[PDB]
């Protein structure tokens, strides 16, 4: 009785915090799309339906999105699969050559500038002894002038190699379900209001994460998951300024984006069994790519976020916005992909307002680059193939990424500027509800029973 | 429409209950512990790390007196300096998480004590079957 005996218990429901790898699983309709044109189907295992997600009660668990892992190895894995999607593809080492470029056939404005150049150059053939003369079109933002006459070259060709993407593979997202191996569990904060740090009483475990589509957007995170009822703002330390501010706003707001130009491609055989695609002729009106959003929706959503900001910055506070300060071309804008072709599209028509403590649209112009260095690699670049026709796409704008300015010296206006920088902000806007825990069985406890012999 | 007893009997469902009622399920936790061009390497070391963990725990039970019983006893009394809690309150008051954070310092003493106690039990049983 009073001689209490210690007894073990194997399989005690209990866990600790840990960090481990994951399990990449999608649906079988990605495998319906055949011949590996979808990336993440070589390694990505097919999912299961009706995944177990059961509630847990009388439970207090502290979460953190900022000291969270699994955004780190996800940022590893996506660039890893990105490089796995290039080793079958083709190099452009024979292409870096002297370019005889000139202005495209257009009524030219002497003061504005056209953004398409007609470049003729020597190129190899199927056979070695035969050289050929071929022309194509390029944007202004990928050639530079070398030195009378005019001769250009590609910008990467002094400093890096270059790889064409295979036109089989697409760049649309598919939902990636992350899962944990046996011996680990994944938790989820089911609370309505959760700024991102501290306890969450409403939690539930899960076996596999929900649908996550991988986007690439330097500002203005697109097609993401949206909040329940309020507009929520999240940060690590709001009084710190250089740390960003994530803004998950409730209602989605539509965007149209297009390039109105009709586009012909042209195959160019580089060598034996090689291929290359280039912008041939442009039929129709030489126009400029752009995007549109609805005026009053943008006004109302900004009213909601200004309503939500003033809890943190004093109730009698003036809040205004500015365009982003500068830096790289792909952080002065938001930078996205549409139909497998990139856009760097000016955002100064949005963040130019002010707010007081009391059928139209918004159009904004874009630019189109072909060669990129996304994630800013050291000698690695990527060509993007020209695609046919006239491209438009419609996306639900989900969140924002902001930065408070360094406002000292007696200021009541606390203006904001949108700046993304790291992609891990975009990713941390998605896995903020989750964390990974390790099961440790074989707990132990006294009770009143002695083993006989 | 699904019933609440099923998600009580689900995996890690009884994490919030008292430990006396959480005793009524261990097999689901035990079962979900086990199993249920470059990437298969990571897959494969995850799987063998899981089974390495499982074999470590099975060996820790195997050197102890109980192998498949999943509910055991022994012959070392509970030191009241470890807990000084009432016997009634521990089974109907606390959860396993806070029990773990209470007894988490008193670790690797009890392990070696179980090893020593049943080693002595092994030599006693050998002596009793040797005299017979």
């Amino acid at each position: 009785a009073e001689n209490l005996w210690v007894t073990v218990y194997y399989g005690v429901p209990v866990w600790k915090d840990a960090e481990t790898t994951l399990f990449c699983a999608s649906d079988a309709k990605a495998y319906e799309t055949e011949k590996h044109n979808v990336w993440a189907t070589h390694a990505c295992v097919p999912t299961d339906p009706n995944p177990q997600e059961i509630h847990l009660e009388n439970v207090t668990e502290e979460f953190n999105m900022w000291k969270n892992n699994m955004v780190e190895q996800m940022h590893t894995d996506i660039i890893s699969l990105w490089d796995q999607s290039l080793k079958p593809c083709v190099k452009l080492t024979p292409l870096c050559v002297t370019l005889q470029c000139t202005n495209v056939t257009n009524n030219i404005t002497d003061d504005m500038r056209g953004e398409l150049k007609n470049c003729s150059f020597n190129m190899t053939t199927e056979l070695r002894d035969k050289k050929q003369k071929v022309y194509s079109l390029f944007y202004r933002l990928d050639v530079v002038q070398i030195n009378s006459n005019k001769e250009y070259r590609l910008i990467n060709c002094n400093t890096s190699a270059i790889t064409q993407a295979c036109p089989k593979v697409s760049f649309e997202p598919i939902p990636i379900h992350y899962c944990a191996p046996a011996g680990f569990a994944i938790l989820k904060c089911k609370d309505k209001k959760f700024n991102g740090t501290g306890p969450c009483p409403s939690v539930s475990t899960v076996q596999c994460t929900h649908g996550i589509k991988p986007v690439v957007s330097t500002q203005l995170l697109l097609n993401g998951s949206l909040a329940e009822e309020e507009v929520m703002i999240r940060s690590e330390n709001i009084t710190n300024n250089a740390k960003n501010i994530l803004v998950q706003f409730n209602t989605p707001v539509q965007i149209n984006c297009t390039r109105p130009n009709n586009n012909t491609r042209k195959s160019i055989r580089i060598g034996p069994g090689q291929a290359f695609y280039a912008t041939g002729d442009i039929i129709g009106d030489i126009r400029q790519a752009h995007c549109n959003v609805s005026k009053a929706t943008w006004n109302e959503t900004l009213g909601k976020v200004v309503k939500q900001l003033r809890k943190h910055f004093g109730n009698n506070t003036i809040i205004r916005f500015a365009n982003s300060s500068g830096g790289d071309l792909e952080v002065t804008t938001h930078s996205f992909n549409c139909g497998g072709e990139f856009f760097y599209c000016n955002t100064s028509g949005l963040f130019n307002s002010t707010w007081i403590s009391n059928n139209d649209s918004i159009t904004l112009p874009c630019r189109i680059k072909q060669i990129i260095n996304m994630w800013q690699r050291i000698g690695q670049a990527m060509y993007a193939p020209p695609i046919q026709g006239v491209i438009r796409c419609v996306s639900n704008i989900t969140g924002l990424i902001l930065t408070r300015d360094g406002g000292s010296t007696n200021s009541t206006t606390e203006t904001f500027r949108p700046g993304g920088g790291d992609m891990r902000d975009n990713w941390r806007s998605e896995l903020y509800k989750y964390k990974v825990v390790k099961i440790e069985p074989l707990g132990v406890a006294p009770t009143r029973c002695k083993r006989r012999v | 429409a699904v019933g609440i007893g099923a998600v009580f009997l689900g995996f890690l469902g009884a994490a919030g209950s008292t430990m006396g009622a959480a005793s009524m399920t261990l097999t689901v936790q035990a079962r979900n512990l086990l199993s249920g061009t470059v990437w298969g390497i990571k897959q494969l070391q995850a799987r063998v790390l899981a089974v390495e963990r499982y074999l470590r725990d099975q060996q820790l039970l195997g050197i102890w007196g109980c192998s498949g019983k999943l509910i055991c006893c022994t012959n070392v009394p509970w030191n009241s300096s470890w807990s000084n809690r009432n016997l009634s309150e521990i089974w109907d008051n606390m959860t396993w998480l806070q029990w773990d954070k209470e007894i988490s310092n008193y670790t690797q003493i009890i392990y070696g004590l179980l090893e020593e106690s049943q080693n002595q039990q092994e030599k006693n049983e050998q002596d009793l079957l040797a005299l017979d």
Partner: antibody
Framework: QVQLQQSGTELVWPGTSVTLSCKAS????????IHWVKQTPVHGLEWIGA????????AYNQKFRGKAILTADKSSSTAYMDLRRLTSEDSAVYYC???????????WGTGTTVTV | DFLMAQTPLSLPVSLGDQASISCRSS???????????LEWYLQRPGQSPKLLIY???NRFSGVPDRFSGSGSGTDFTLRISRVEAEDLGIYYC?????????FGGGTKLEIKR
């Protein structure tokens, strides 16, 4: 016969506490899971919580967290819902109802209006 | 959490005509046993909610074959072959697959002239 004999209609003050009863009638109490359904005119129906009759295992909606407390009597076969520190939104119709696991609600009680 | 958007939220329709309610979930509310535990209720104004449809293809024991249900994954459809004065009340799509359970908005059945 098979009926959820509920409590009486309660007309209470703000901030008080009250207990709503639900006697199982005509069947085996100790196996059929008891649920509680809030009925306001503004929201319609809401899930309050649930209690296992045999073990007393409860689970509550996040809205009702600390607002409602479920007990059960195996002797009198009667579920009890303690409602504490009442506000005017508690002025509603509370339905006692029962199921078995992986099945539906068959029996529906009277529906007790509690007006704060 | 697994919320239910019930369209419509009130059904005025004459007697003898069919009825169709599309209740759409946020995502898959299927439990691990494969069954999509959606339930449809009828609370008359002044009476308790009598169950119409559980286990969407199935019907309540006693509720006639006029009633029926279909729908999967997200998009769910209560169907009635003919609307009666006995059918009147409020209809409910109800996620019965996980705790916390969620009700829909309800659909007040009435008569349109």
């Amino acid at each position: 016969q098979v009926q959820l004999q509920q409590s009486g209609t309660e007309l209470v003050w703000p901030g008080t506490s009250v207990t709503l009863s639900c006697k199982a009638s005509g069947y085996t109490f100790t196996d059929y899971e008891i649920h509680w359904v809030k009925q306001t005119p503004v929201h319609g129906l809401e899930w309050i919580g649930a209690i296992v009759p045999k073990t007393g295992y409860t689970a509550y909606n996040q809205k009702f967290r600390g607002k409602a407390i479920l007990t059960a009597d195996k002797s009198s076969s009667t579920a009890y819902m303690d409602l504490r520190r009442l506000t005017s939104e508690d002025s509603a119709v509370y339905y006692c109802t029962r199921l078995r696991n992986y099945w539906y609600f068959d029996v529906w009680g009277t529906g007790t209006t509690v007006t704060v | 959490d697994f919320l239910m958007a019930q369209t419509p939220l009130s059904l005025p329709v004459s007697l003898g005509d069919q009825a169709s309610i599309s209740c759409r979930s946020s995502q898959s509310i299927v439990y691990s046993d494969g069954n999509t535990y959606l339930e449809w209720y009828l609370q008359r104004p002044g009476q308790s909610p009598k169950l119409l449809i559980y286990k969407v293809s199935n019907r309540f024991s006693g509720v006639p074959d006029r009633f029926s249900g279909s729908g999967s994954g997200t998009d769910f459809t209560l169907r009635i072959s003919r609307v009666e004065a006995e059918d009147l009340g409020i209809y409910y799509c109800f996620q019965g697959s996980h705790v916390p359970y969620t009700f829909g908005g309800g659909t007040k059945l009435e008569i349109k002239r």
